[PDB]
Design a protein around this ligand. Sequence first.
Ligand SMILES: *[C@@H]1O[C@H](CO)[C@@H](O[C@@H]2O[C@H](CO)[C@@H](O[C@@H]3O[C@H](CO)[C@@H](O)[C@H](O[C@H]4O[C@H](CO)[C@@H](O)[C@H](O)[C@@H]4O)[C@@H]3O)[C@H](O)[C@H]2NC(C)=O)[C@H](O)[C@H]1NC(C)=O
Ligand SMILES: *[C@@H]1O[C@H](CO)[C@@H](O[C@@H]2O[C@H](CO)[C@@H](O)[C@H](O)[C@H]2NC(C)=O)[C@H](O)[C@H]1NC(C)=O
Ligand SMILES: *[C@@H]1O[C@H](CO)[C@@H](O)[C@H](O)[C@H]1NC(C)=O
Ligand SMILES: *[C@@H]1O[C@H](CO)[C@@H](O)[C@H](O)[C@H]1NC(C)=O
Ligand SMILES: [Cl-]
Length: 871
Amino acid sequence: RKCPNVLNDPVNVRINCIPEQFPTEGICAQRGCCWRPWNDSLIPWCFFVDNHGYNVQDMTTTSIGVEAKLNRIPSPTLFGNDINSVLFTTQNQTPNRFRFKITDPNNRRYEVPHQYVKEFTGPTVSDTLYDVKVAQNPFSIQVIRKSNGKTLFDTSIGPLVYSDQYLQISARLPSDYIYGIGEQVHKRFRHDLSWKTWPIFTRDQLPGDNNNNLYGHQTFFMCIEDTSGKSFGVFLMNSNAMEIFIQPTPIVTYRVTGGILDFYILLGDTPEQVVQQYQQLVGLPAMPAYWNLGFQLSRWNYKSLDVVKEVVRRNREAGIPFDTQVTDIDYMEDKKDFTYDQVAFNGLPQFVQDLHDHGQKYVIILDPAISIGRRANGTTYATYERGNTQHVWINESDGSTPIIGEVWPGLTVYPDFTNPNCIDWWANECSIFHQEVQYDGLWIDMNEVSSFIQGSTKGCNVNKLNYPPFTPDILDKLMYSKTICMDAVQNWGKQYDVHSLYGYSMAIATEQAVQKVFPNKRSFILTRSTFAGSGRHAAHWLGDNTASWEQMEWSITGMLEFSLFGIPLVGADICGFVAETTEELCRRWMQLGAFYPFSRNHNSDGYEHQDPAFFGQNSLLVKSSRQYLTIRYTLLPFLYTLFYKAHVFGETVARPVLHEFYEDTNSWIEDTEFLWGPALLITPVLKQGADTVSAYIPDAIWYDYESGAKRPWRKQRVDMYLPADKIGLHLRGGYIIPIQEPDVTTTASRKNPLGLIVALGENNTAKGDFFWDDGETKDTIQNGNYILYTFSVSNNTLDIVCTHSSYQEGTTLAFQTVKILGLTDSVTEVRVAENNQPMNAHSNFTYDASNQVLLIADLKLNLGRNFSVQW
Ligand SMILES: *[C@@H]1O[C@H](CO)[C@@H](O[C@@H]2O[C@H](CO)[C@@H](O[C@@H]3O[C@H](CO)[C@@H](O)[C@H](O[C@H]4O[C@H](CO)[C@@H](O)[C@H](O)[C@@H]4O)[C@@H]3O)[C@H](O)[C@H]2NC(C)=O)[C@H](O)[C@H]1NC(C)=O
Ligand SMILES: *[C@@H]1O[C@H](CO)[C@@H](O[C@@H]2O[C@H](CO)[C@@H](O)[C@H](O)[C@H]2NC(C)=O)[C@H](O)[C@H]1NC(C)=O
Ligand SMILES: *[C@@H]1O[C@H](CO)[C@@H](O)[C@H](O)[C@H]1NC(C)=O
Ligand SMILES: *[C@@H]1O[C@H](CO)[C@@H](O)[C@H](O)[C@H]1NC(C)=O
Ligand SMILES: [Cl-]
């Protein structure tokens, strides 16, 4: 009896027993599964029922959870090499965090050498939010929210399959609303449940309208259980190539090509809390330098320093705020790291001095792969000589011959960033180069790792690693496609196991380079490839996008997913990397892009210039771009405080509407607009030819940003008028945000007067806060060298409370302007008290009753002190 008892079984709960090929009766019979072909090709024709799996043999309680020996039910194999006996272990890590793993007690299988996640042995946790039930015949696990008895994660729906190069487990989930998994192009933030496959294996590929695995390896996803906001997260700690399959019910199935099963289930009262718990586990995001938040200009192939200078000149002339000039691989001599082109980039050091004189920053690209060739003068490439002497390279399977691939400079060897000696070499290369070219930050690219020859110069050995028995739906269906051989050797292990950790290890390595090059500074690291917890070391951008309306639209989902992944400094190539942009598209994308946490206009090789001033000093594009970038720069104290909260508490920066308005099921699918923290709603034009956007307005009071006027919209879908020069910007009632008088660089804006915008809620209250430090020193938060404020308004009294003050230079700044929105009662008098001394009349205010706005001007409320302001 291989089949269910009823002839018309529930099809949505069929678990595919022939996941990898078109279903045939013979293969189904040979695998011992149930054959029932269907109306279509979405529903499985061959499925498992209870034919495969494991039984519990012995189970005992430990001080921190459970341990069960599992024995395999003696059925036919799927892909060979079954592990007959397996050890199931659980850990009640915190009240919100549950962990289980399934290992081989007789063979120490590959485990991810994560540099943050720690060994756990205690302390024993008395009151957990989760209950865990383990069924014995067959083996299954149920994770239950104790408060309402709701099962969150239920594996009894399918078998445990555990074999050397194929691991499989499924879980039924309690709601139809799931978010996360990457890096792929999802198009929609909320997951399509209709039989979708998501492959995960770091890969250099242009994002497009398909399910390809792209640059990062992110298994995390979360699920909102109900309108209460209760939510949970599922994280698999495994870096092997895999597929995540989603079907209606919903059921999620993992199909993984190696390693162990090591799952974390994370409970939260809200979706934001789930994300916070996730970051608590894998590592809180790095605090960026304040300048990282400035607008960046960039393109592949400016071709000469003369062109770079002209681009800089024209955008300065237009008054485009921008902190940073980025230079791509053309700055190098013949695309070799740690060189610059003495011909086309003659005078580069003096150009960097000019940037620095204008208070601007210079960022360079670095690729991991090192040329095996000579320099242009015929001399040895010292970077390679020194790498050879230090034995820093990834080796062939022989464990002694460096593997040769190909990238930009030609044939290349690959640093093993997991090797301590390689980290030192790299730090030393960055330091040597910084004496020649005084760059301020680093963009680390092609670190999947990418290769333009398949596997290596010698091809690949035909073995089980380069050609596994199960191949997930990865692009090309070939493990070593666009990368190095699976049997290549690193300090952390075989490429088969550690491939997806290359970008992760390189960011760690480059973080240590930064500490050598810029002692005790944050600098900037932008990475292409990421793994779980990469946000602790770097920023990310969505990679090599295209100049189309669709790609602009999809960038919001892309951004939001990385927020979930705890990589808050994220954005897309504004105006589009591949292809020529149009004036309309670039103007719209500049508006939206001013509100990416990471804001950079970047262009591919050979297409027309798309920096803002190129469209004309008097263009509508320059005017619109200058205006929204000035708004961005004005809001940087607010944005920066969000990054402080991400770094310390795991809160998101660019935030899904769902995170604030989960009580409203309309927010569950909302992905064409987003929030900065809880307080600012950004609604872009995303369709060619449009001056009107169908927008969902959540259940809050909203004030138009530019005019302060209350919108007559609440908890409704509106047709928002947004003509050519307008993007939708609304402030939410109940929040107080800090601002600073803007300038064209953050270097200048940081010296300017501060202000506060109070957007009053329904009961005329509001709250918020403000973090301020030197903007650059690593560990200011750890060492307590910062200023911290809370703000609170009720009944026409603003309280400004300094809860921490240990940054003397911050003290030279002052709040000089207070704006109150939605103020319904007239103002007779404004009074100010400092440090609980008596109130003095303040004469400079304007009460606009038509607009309900109170402007209080010419204040001098110095940072470091407490104030009260009454109207
Ligand atoms: C902002 O200012 C407004 C004034 O415009 C101010 O409103 C007042 O608040 C108090 C509450 O602190 C109200 O007093 C309550 O009145 C209701 C009847 O209307 C009673 O039910 C309440 O008694 C209960 O609660 C007490 C505890 O507060 C218990 O001791 C008692 O046994 C009862 O359980 C209570 O007396 C007052 O009526 C209003 N006035 C007006 C005009 O509405 C408001 O509190 C201020 N808001 C903030 C944020 O501070
Ligand atoms: C890759 O191959 C090189 C040898 O070509 C290995 O280099 C050794 O590195 C250690 C330092 O850690 C030296 O003490 C040895 O002398 C080196 N061996 C030789 C023969 O030069 C390197 O360890 C290999 N890397 C990996 C991870 O396999
Ligand atoms: C598929 O089959 C079932 C009964 O076997 C039927 O209810 C359903 O309508 C069929 N699907 C279609 C679209 O014909
Ligand atoms: C007060 O407002 C007036 C009106 O603009 C202005 O001229 C004056 O300089 C302001 N500032 C101070 C500090 O009083
Ligand atoms: Cl810095």
